[PDB]
Amino acid sequence: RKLWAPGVVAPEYLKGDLAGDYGWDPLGLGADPTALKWYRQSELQHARWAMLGVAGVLVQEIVKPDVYFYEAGLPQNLPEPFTNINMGGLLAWEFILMHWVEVRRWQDYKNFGSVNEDPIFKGNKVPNPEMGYPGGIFDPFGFSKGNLKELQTKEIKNGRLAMIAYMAFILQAQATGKGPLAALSAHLSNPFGNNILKNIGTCTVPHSVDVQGLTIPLTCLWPGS
Amino acid sequence: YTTAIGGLVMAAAMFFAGWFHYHKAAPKLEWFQNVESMLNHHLGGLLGLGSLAWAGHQIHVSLPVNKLLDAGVDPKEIPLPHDLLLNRAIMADLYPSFAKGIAPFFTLNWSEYSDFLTFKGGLNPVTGGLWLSDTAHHHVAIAVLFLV
Amino acid sequence: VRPVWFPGNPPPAHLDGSLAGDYGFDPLFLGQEPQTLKWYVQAELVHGRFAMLGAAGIILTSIGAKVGLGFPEWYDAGKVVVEKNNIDFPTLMVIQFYLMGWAETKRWYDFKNPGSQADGSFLGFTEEFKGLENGYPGGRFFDPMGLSRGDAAKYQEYKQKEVKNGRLAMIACLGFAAQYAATGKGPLDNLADHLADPNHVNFATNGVSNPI
Amino acid sequence: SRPLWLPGSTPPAHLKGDLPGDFGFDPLGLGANAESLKWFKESELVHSRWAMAAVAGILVQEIVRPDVFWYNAGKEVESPLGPLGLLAVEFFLMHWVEVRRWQDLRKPGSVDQDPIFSQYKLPPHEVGYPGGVFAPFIPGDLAELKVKEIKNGRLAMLAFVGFVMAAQVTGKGPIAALQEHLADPWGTTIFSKAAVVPGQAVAPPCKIPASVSYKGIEIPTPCFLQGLWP
Amino acid sequence: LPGDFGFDPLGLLDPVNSGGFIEPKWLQYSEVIHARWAMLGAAGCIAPEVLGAAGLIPDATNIKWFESGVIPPAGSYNGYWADPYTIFFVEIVAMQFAELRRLQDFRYPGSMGQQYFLGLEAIFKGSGDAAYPGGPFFNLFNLGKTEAAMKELKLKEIKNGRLAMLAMLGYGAQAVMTGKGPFQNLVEHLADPVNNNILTNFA
Numbered sequence A: 001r002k003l004w005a006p007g008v009v010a011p012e013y014l015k016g017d018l019a020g021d022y023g024w025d026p027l028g029l030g031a032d033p034t035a036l037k038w039y040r041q042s043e044l045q046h047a048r049w050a051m052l053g054v055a056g057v058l059v060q061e062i063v064k065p066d067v068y069f070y071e072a073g074l075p076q077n078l079p080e081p082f083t084n085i086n087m088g089g090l091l092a093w094e095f096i097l098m099h100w101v102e103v104r105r106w107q108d109y110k111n112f113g114s115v116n117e118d119p120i121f122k123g124n125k126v127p128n129p130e131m132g133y134p135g136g137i138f139d140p141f142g143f144s145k146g147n148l149k150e151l152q153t154k155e156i157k158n159g160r161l162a163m164i165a166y167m168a169f170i171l172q173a174q175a176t177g178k179g180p181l182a183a184l185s186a187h188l189s190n191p192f193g194n195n196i197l198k199n200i201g202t203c204t205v206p207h208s209v210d211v212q213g214l215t216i217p218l219t220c221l222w223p224g225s
Numbered sequence B: 001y002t003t004a005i006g007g008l009v010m011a012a013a014m015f016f017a018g019w020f021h022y023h024k025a026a027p028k029l030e031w032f033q034n035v036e037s038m039l040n041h042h043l044g045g046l047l048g049l050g051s052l053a054w055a056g057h058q059i060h061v062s063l064p065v066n067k068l069l070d071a072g073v074d075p076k077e078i079p080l081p082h083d084l085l086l087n088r089a090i091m092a093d094l095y096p097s098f099a100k101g102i103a104p105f106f107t108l109n110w111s112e113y114s115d116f117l118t119f120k121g122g123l124n125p126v127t128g129g130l131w132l133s134d135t136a137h138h139h140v141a142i143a144v145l146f147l148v
Numbered sequence C: 001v002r003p004v005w006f007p008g009n010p011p012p013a014h015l016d017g018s019l020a021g022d023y024g025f026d027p028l029f030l031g032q033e034p035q036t037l038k039w040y041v042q043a044e045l046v047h048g049r050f051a052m053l054g055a056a057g058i059i060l061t062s063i064g065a066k067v068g069l070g071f072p073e074w075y076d077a078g079k080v081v082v083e084k085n086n087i088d089f090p091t092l093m094v095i096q097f098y099l100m101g102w103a104e105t106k107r108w109y110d111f112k113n114p115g116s117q118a119d120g121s122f123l124g125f126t127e128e129f130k131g132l133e134n135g136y137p138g139g140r141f142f143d144p145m146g147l148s149r150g151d152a153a154k155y156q157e158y159k160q161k162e163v164k165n166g167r168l169a170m171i172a173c174l175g176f177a178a179q180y181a182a183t184g185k186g187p188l189d190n191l192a193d194h195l196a197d198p199n200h201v202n203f204a205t206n207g208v209s210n211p212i
Numbered sequence D: 001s002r003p004l005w006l007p008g009s010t011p012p013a014h015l016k017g018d019l020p021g022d023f024g025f026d027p028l029g030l031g032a033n034a035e036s037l038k039w040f041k042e043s044e045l046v047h048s049r050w051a052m053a054a055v056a057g058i059l060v061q062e063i064v065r066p067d068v069f070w071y072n073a074g075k076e077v078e079s080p081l082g083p084l085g086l087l088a089v090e091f092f093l094m095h096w097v098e099v100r101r102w103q104d105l106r107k108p109g110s111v112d113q114d115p116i117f118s119q120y121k122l123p124p125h126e127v128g129y130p131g132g133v134f135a136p137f138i139p140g141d142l143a144e145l146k147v148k149e150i151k152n153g154r155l156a157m158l159a160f161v162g163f164v165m166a167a168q169v170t171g172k173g174p175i176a177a178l179q180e181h182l183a184d185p186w187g188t189t190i191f192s193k194a195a196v197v198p199g200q201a202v203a204p205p206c207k208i209p210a211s212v213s214y215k216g217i218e219i220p221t222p223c224f225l226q227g228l229w230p
Numbered sequence E: 001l002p003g004d005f006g007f008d009p010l011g012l013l014d015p016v017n018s019g020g021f022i023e024p025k026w027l028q029y030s031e032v033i034h035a036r037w038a039m040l041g042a043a044g045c046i047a048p049e050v051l052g053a054a055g056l057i058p059d060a061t062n063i064k065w066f067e068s069g070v071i072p073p074a075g076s077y078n079g080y081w082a083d084p085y086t087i088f089f090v091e092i093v094a095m096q097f098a099e100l101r102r103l104q105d106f107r108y109p110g111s112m113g114q115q116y117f118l119g120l121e122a123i124f125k126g127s128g129d130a131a132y133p134g135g136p137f138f139n140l141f142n143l144g145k146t147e148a149a150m151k152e153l154k155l156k157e158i159k160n161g162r163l164a165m166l167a168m169l170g171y172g173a174q175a176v177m178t179g180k181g182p183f184q185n186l187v188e189h190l191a192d193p194v195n196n197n198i199l200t201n202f203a
């Protein structure tokens, strides 16, 4: 197995069972096995939400380049069918739906193989071969019968890359005031101008933007003013 | 008030020192019986470096502040002593030797320090005490004598 | 090993871990004698209970005060409650001493003789004034829901939670006191003030906390 | 083990399946003592039944006689009966009934006999379910109807507290509030009225007035827990 | 044992009849700690001047090292995200945790891998020695992996540290006397060697 660095002995609790295992854990937070399981679930959740977020920013920049994603949540920028929607009700929808699904998944964490069964239409079920990869209706096309391992590694690697690139999206979104592709094209405008050496230190985000009734406090990741 | 707090802190330091040297690190006999080392360190360190340090304090705080107080200005308008340490030009206003810095000292041209290291005799006629320049010159000579 | 108040030092000899909230914290060795430690156990529990109840009072009254209801802030409620209804101050204080003295004396002489008040001297009551442990006087009056005589390990969990929350409340009430002495304003007003400008409204800006 | 709340979890060691409608819901462990559990069992049954009767009262009261604000109804219906006389009749009658029932609780199998007419005697029962003249017949079976009554009861208790808050925020009845909410689902929820942010917090205004002058001596009317609304 | 150069005329490394804070196993530890902080501080005192002279940071910065806000009389800088006191409280708490735990490893070796500290426990085991803990984080990459190379790295650490300590004393003395930055002194002295020295700057 290739390591995360040349000439580094691998830890004893990282053997190769999990995917994307390079033996890299300098802080040793995965010493406890239950900790290793819960943090594995954390890595999978972060990977998958981050991949969705990266594709979201990218495709919104490809399709309609007017939508600046960092400002896209304000209640007047939303698309065709509704443009003055009450954010309280929208928050209610999101709250109930996401609560149901995430509480269900947590219950799958505490008791392995206990919430597979459909509570309403009782002849439905999904077989999870490993914890965190459900399958079944979550695999409507069935790409998960060839060894499943290389697809685990591909998923987790692409996810790590997506997490880093998404924090890039937010960071240079707050530094230079432009989206991702706009920043790439503006860097291809002149490479020596428009650099990190010049644009940082200026954090173009407002202090507190107003939504319909309340005032959200806003923070940038580093004090630039 | 600051001096009071400092004194109390030093007192606690002394009691802790006593506890330490009787209970935790207590010297042997032959530490005590080295009287010659004790003579060297007392004569040089305590007496001499105390004299030299206090000469420093007089030259840099007590001479100018008392010069202003005896000049007649009320004590609040007098600059704080750290302004006297940091700003050379105020000392250059009071005693012009300070405008040359410490160049006279290291080239043995000590005659240019005759503005704040004097030898006049009697008393300060406006005050009733000794001349403080004499006092500073005195501690400087004392320190050289004891360090020798 | 137990979690110690100072990772690395062994805990003192008189503290074992049978108590609740036992972290081995005793640098001055104030509880070396078992009777003295027993008395201090009761003292900590009582101070904690009054502190929890008091801090709940302060926080709830301040929440009602910032929102426009007309509640006074806690440094003013005594004056306005005594003044506004009709209440004479000293008679209220005297009745406080009557009732508190009665109940508190019962507690004291239950500490001296551990099972004495369960005799029937008070009006008719037997085994509802018998103590369960040191400072845990659970009966029908003091544990009416009945949590102490079921799920013993879970009850130990409740003991641990009580002591931790009590200690937190004690230093919280100390916070209310010193905070009002420094800023001269209400506590949740201070919370909103710090929450508006965290980098520039704190203790290092009053000029009273650090006089440097 | 039939289902349980949050299915897949483990029930507490003191809840087993003897009672109707038990599902292992005791995270606080408030039913560890059997002697507590009997009193709390009776408490649940009685609260459930009062809530069912009161919720049906509120619904049907709005339906049959609309535009009579149930939250004000005391200031309303006043009759040639004095309110003092009504309070007296309620006091004595309800005092009798509750004392009899509680005597049955603390001493089982004692108050089964009619005091006046010595012929009639209530048959043996399980506590909280007297039977006899209190239930002429059973449609269906007992062990299911116990579950059904506890379910409709818990739902009813939640329904009444929903009624109270739904009146103290909006100011209308239950069905009228339902019409208002179906008129604009996105804009009339509890999340659409108030919110708390680290910057600021806003609460709904209380529709219900201050001290109510019923007959000169005013009744102070507060809303429940005014200072902690959203 | 590192850095032993046959020095020490005043005789402080005698184990016989030693105690308190003067002993071989505390003076060496103090040397390495001072060396590490001195390396860090030396680079920190130079960096704004060299980075600002090469044009990499703006001119709001490029201030001399005694004008950061360390000595408010000598000059402070407004533009930090808070007051220097609010910075200082954070410093107190953080350095308290770090230095205090380090002390606990010195007094009781190995006693920093038992009590729960957010799972950071395999990292703080330490080793046989107390000035070179190691572990997965203090030794990220396994530098040297052997014995013949470890002494060389320790020796280079020591010699660089001693050089750094002398350098930092130099920065202090120069900042007292001439009142300018260290890179400013290097520029001025490399301009005119004979006409810029210590003895020309006796004023």
Ligand code: CLA
Pocket (backbone or CB within 6 Å): B015, B016, B017, B018, B019, B022
């Ligand atoms: C709390 C810390 C502590 C403790 C537990 C001890 C304990 C002990 N010390 Mg120790 N000691 C301490 C601090 C402490 N000391 C400190 C800080 C010092 C440095 C001053 C010393 C210096 C010291 C010496 C030199 C000796 C001891 C001795 C002893 C032993 C007997 C002490 C005794 O009976 O005298 C108890 C005496 C008193 C309580 C008298 C109080 C004295 C104070 C300083 C008077 C100050 C008041 C002052 C006069 C103001 C009054 C005004 C006016 C009205 C008079 C005992 C093991 C002796 C020993 O081991 O014998 C072989 C011994 O020889 N210790």
Ligand code: CLA
Pocket (backbone or CB within 6 Å): B031, B032, B034, B037, B038, B041, B042, B045, B046
């Ligand atoms: C420069 C070094 C130096 C200095 C300043 C002193 C100073 C002193 N020694 Mg001393 N001593 C020294 C070297 C030194 N000694 C050496 C090398 C030996 C061993 C041969 C001794 C052995 C010795 C004995 C046996 C005794 C003293 C005593 C005293 C005190 C006399 C009381 C007095 O009038 O002080 C005036 C008061 C002051 C000047 C206040 C200033 C005090 C501060 C703490 C300065 C002390 C400097 C400190 C010694 C340097 C080391 C500090 C430590 C943290 C490492 C005085 C504080 C006597 C004494 O009082 O014992 C406590 C005493 O009994 N000394």
Ligand code: CLA
Pocket (backbone or CB within 6 Å): B052, B053, B054, B055, B056, B057, B059, B084, B085, B086, B087, B088, B091, B097, B098, B100, B101, B102, B105, B140, E070, E168, E169, E171, E172, E173, E176, E177
């Ligand atoms: C013993 C007491 C004493 C002390 C403390 C001082 C101190 C001072 N005198 Mg002075 N003086 C004294 C006695 C003393 N003198 C006597 C007896 C005379 C009569 C001959 C004079 C005559 C005299 C004149 C004529 C002048 C001074 C001046 C000065 C000041 C500047 C000295 C200078 O130019 O650089 C000397 C350089 C040094 C002393 C080197 C300091 C090295 C530093 C402290 C090391 C710090 C390093 C450290 C690692 C930093 C930490 C970094 C990090 C932790 C932040 C300085 C405050 C000058 C001045 O400013 O006038 C107001 C001046 O013009 N004095």
Ligand code: CLA
Pocket (backbone or CB within 6 Å): D005, D015, D019, D020, D021, D022, D023, D024, D025, D026, D029, D030, D031, D032, D037, D040, D041, D042, D043, D044, D047, D048, D154, D155, D157, D158, D161
């Ligand atoms: C009148 C209130 C009341 C009371 C006394 C009981 C009593 C009981 N219920 Mg119960 N229940 C109620 C209302 C009540 N229920 C409601 C409204 C619901 C629907 C949410 C349920 C749902 C429910 C389930 C699903 C289960 C029980 C069970 C039980 C039994 C064992 C649990 C126990 O010891 O709790 C004792 C109860 C109390 C000590 C009352 C606590 C009151 C607290 C102190 C007030 C604070 C509440 C707080 C304000 C939150 C309010 C809700 C908000 C939305 C308004 C016990 C007989 C379990 C069972 O049947 O096993 C035998 C079981 O599985 N209940």
Ligand code: CLA
Pocket (backbone or CB within 6 Å): B013, B014, B016, B017, B020, B025, B027, E018, E019, E020, E021, E022
């Ligand atoms: C005044 C009398 C005096 C005397 C003679 C001694 C003598 C001794 N002490 Mg000691 N000590 C004293 C006062 C004294 N101490 C006080 C007041 C304290 C409390 C702070 C201590 C605390 C103390 C400890 C904690 C330890 C000693 C140790 C020692 C022994 C070795 C000291 C050595 O070589 O280190 C050489 C000293 C240094 C390298 C330090 C020099 C720099 C410090 C800061 C002192 C500077 C003093 C100077 C006056 C400051 C001027 C201020 C100016 C710079 C602005 C020796 C027996 C050590 C021991 O027992 O080991 C064998 C030991 O562990 N002492």
Ligand SMILES: CC1=C[C@H](O)CC(C)(C)[C@H]1/C=C/C(C)=C/C=C/C(C)=C/C=C/C=C(C)/C=C/C=C(C)/C=C/C1=C(C)C[C@H](O)CC1(C)C
Pocket (backbone or CB within 6 Å): E008, E009, E010, E011, E012, E034, E037, E038, E040, E041, E042, E043, E044, E045, E064, E065, E066, E068, E070, E165, E166, E168, E169
């Ligand atoms: C060997 C021997 C032998 C014999 O036997 C005896 C004898 C002689 C005694 C001995 C000797 C000794 C010596 C010489 C010593 C020296 C020391 C030093 C100098 C130190 C420093 C030391 C020094 C040090 C630590 C320093 C450090 C520093 C630092 C951190 C800094 C910091 C900073 C920075 C970054 C910058 C900014 O802006 C500011 C600040 C914040 C401030």
